[PDB]
UniProtKB/Swiss-Prot annotation, chain A:
Homododecamer. Interacts with the Cargo protein 1. Interacts with the major capsid protein. The chain holds residues 404 to 454 of 806 of the full protein. It is found in: Virion. It comes from the Viruses. Forms the portal vertex of the capsid. Probably involved in head assembly, genome packaging, tail attachment, and genome ejection. It comes from Bacteroides phage crAss001 (Bacteroides phage PhiCrAss001). This is Portal protein.
Curated annotation (Swiss-Prot), chain B:
Its main location: virion. GO terms for cellular component: virus tail. This is Ring protein 1. Forms the tail multi-ring barrel with ring protein 2, ring protein 3 and ring protein 4. It comes from the Viruses. The keyword Flavoprotein does not apply. Homododecamer. The keyword Protein biosynthesis does not apply. Disulfide bonds: none annotated. It comes from Bacteroides phage crAss001. It is found in: Virion. The barrel is composed of five stacked dodecameric ring structures. Podoviridae-like phages usually possess only one such ring. The tail is thus rather long. Keywords: Viral tail protein, Virion. Pfam families: CrAss_Ring_1.
Length: 51, 226
C-alpha cells in the first residue's frame, strides 16, 4: 500500500461466513439435523416395508 | 421378577402340606415328582440356573452337557457370532452360508464341521443331595402346595373319598394362585423395565442383538445433539 510499509499479505484471500466473530453456522449445518431425522424415519419406513 | 430367588430345600413344601390331615400320606418321593411337574408346567425361566459351557464339534455333531434343559444361545467360540435354528433338511448330507444348529437329545447338530461352540443353557438348581431346590417365595410355595393338594384331591375324588365341592374349591384356588404366581415371576422389576425401555425407544431401531448375546438389548440409544 502507498502509505503503510507494513501492509502486506499473501496470495490467499477469502472470507468466513460467520456471525459476530464466531465459527460459521453454515447452510449444511442448519439442514443436517433434519437430514439425519429423515434418514432415521425412512429407516423405520423401509423396515416396515420389509415386514 | 421383583423379588430374589432365595433357594430352600424341598421338604419346606412338606412342612406346609402336612398341616392338612388329608395329605399326611404324602412323601418326599411324591413331592419330587409333583414339584418337577409344577416347575415344567409353569415354565418360569427365573427358576433355572443359567450356565455357559463350551463343547467341540466333531463333524456337524457335538456332545451336549448332562444337566441341560433348554438353550438360551449357541455361538462360535472364536468369533462370538450366534447360531440360529437350522431349517435345512439335508445339513451334513452331501450331493454328488451362515452357521446354525439343531438339538434333540444329548447331541447338537450344527452346520459346521470342526469348531468349538459356546452354549448358554438353563439347568435346575440342585441340593447337596442330587435333588431339586425350590424358591422360597411364599407365592411359589403356596402355588406348589395347591398344585400337590389338587392332584391328591383329584385322585381321592376319582375314588370318591372327597366331595366334588371340595375338589371344585381346590381347583379354583389353585387356578387363581397359578395365575398370580405366573405374574409374580414374569412382571419385570425396575431395572428390567429400564432395559425394556432402552429396548423400546430407539430413533434408529436396533435389530441385530441376536448376533451378540443380546448384550446390547437394554443399552440406551444416544443421539448426538447438532
Amino acid at each position: 500500500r502507498l502509505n503503510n510499509p507494513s501492509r502486506c499479505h499473501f496470495g490467499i484471500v477469502g472470507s468466513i461466513y460467520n456471525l459476530n466473530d464466531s465459527r460459521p453456522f453454515s447452510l449444511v449445518d442448519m439442514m443436517k439435523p433434519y437430514n439425519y431425522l429423515y434418514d432415521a424415519i425412512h429407516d423405520r419406513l423401509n423396515k416396515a416395508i420389509a415386514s | 421378577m421383583v423379588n430374589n430367588i432365595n433357594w430352600v430345600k424341598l421338604p419346606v413344601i412338606l412342612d406346609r402340606l402336612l398341616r392338612h390331615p388329608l395329605l399326611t400320606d404324602l412323601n418326599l418321593e411324591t413331592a419330587i415328582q409333583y414339584t418337577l411337574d409344577f416347575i415344567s408346567a409353569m415354565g418360569l425361566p427365573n427358576v433355572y440356573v443359567d450356565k455357559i459351557e463350551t463343547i467341540d464339534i466333531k463333524e456337524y455333531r457335538g456332545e451336549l452337557p448332562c444337566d441341560l434343559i433348554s438353550i438360551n444361545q449357541v455361538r462360535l467360540h472364536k468369533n462370538g457370532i450366534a447360531l440360529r435354528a437350522m431349517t435345512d433338511n439335508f445339513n451334513a448330507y452331501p450331493t454328488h452360508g451362515e452357521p446354525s444348529f439343531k438339538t434333540q437329545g444329548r447331541v447338537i447338530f450344527t452346520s459346521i464341521k470342526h469348531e468349538k461352540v459356546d452354549i448358554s443353557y438353563k439347568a435346575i438348581m440342585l441340593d447337596d443331595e442330587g435333588l431339586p431346590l425350590i424358591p422360597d417365595n411364599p407365592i411359589f410355595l403356596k402355588t406348589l402346595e395347591l398344585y400337590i393338594k389338587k392332584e391328591w384331591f383329584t385322585i381321592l375324588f376319582d375314588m370318591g373319598k372327597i366331595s366334588p365341592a371340595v375338589l371344585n374349591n381346590t381347583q379354583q384356588e389353585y387356578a387363581f394362585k397359578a395365575g398370580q404366581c405366573n405374574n409374580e415371576f414374569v412382571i419385570p422389576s425396575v431395572s428390567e423395565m429400564e432395559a425394556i425401555t432402552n429396548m423400546w425407544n430407539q430413533l434408529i431401531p436396533r435389530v441385530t442383538e441376536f448376533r451378540r448375546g443380546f448384550k446390547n438389548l437394554g443399552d440406551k440409544e444416544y443421539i448426538r445433539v447438532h
